[PDB]
């Protein structure tokens, strides 16, 4: 079951960010962002990802651009940025 504080596909911010719970279904390939091949981009290795957010699970983390909510560790958004930190 997905947390109640999970980002909905129909969420304004989600639509603006072009975020999708399942990265294999995102347009990450067409976006082609620097860092690594799109085929390998997902929330899991994103700079903005935070296993800080409360209620975070193994499949669900917090996201700096999504305060108060949780994203799918296997999701993706047009804002992806290779994790260094
Ligand atoms: S910015 Fe990163 S962690 Fe947040 S939703 Fe987009 S890809 Fe996932």
Q: What is the resolution of this structure in A?
A: 2.0
- Tell the residue number behind the tokens 């260094």, with chain if given: 84
Distance 25 CA to ligand 1 centre (A): 14
63 is in an annotated binding site: yes
CB 83 within 8 A of CB 42: no
Number of domains in the chain: 1
- Which CATH number fits the domain that encloses residue 20? 4.10.490.10
What atom in ligand 1 is closest to the CA of residue 71? 5
Dihedral angle, C-alpha 77, 10, 63, 70, nearest 10 °: -130
Angle (CA) 57-59-44 rounded to 5° is: 110
The technique is X-ray
Please check whether residue 43 is in contact with residue 61, taking contact to mean a CB–CB distance below 8 angstroms.
yes
Structural domain harbouring 9: 1-85
Q: Look up tokens 């995102």; give the residue.
A: 26
What's the distance, CA 77 to chain centroid? 6
């Amino acid at each position: 079951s997905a947390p109640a504080n999970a980002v909905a596909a129909d969420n304004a911010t989600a639509i603006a960010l072009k975020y999708n719970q399942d990265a294999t279904k995102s347009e990450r390939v067409a976006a082609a962002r620097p860092g690594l091949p799109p085929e390998e981009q997902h929330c899991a290795d994103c700079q903005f990802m935070q296993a800080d957010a409360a209620g975070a699970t193994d499949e669900w983390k917090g996201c700096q651009l999504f305060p108060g909510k949780l994203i799918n560790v296997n999701g993706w958004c047009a804002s992806w940025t290779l994790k260094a930190g």
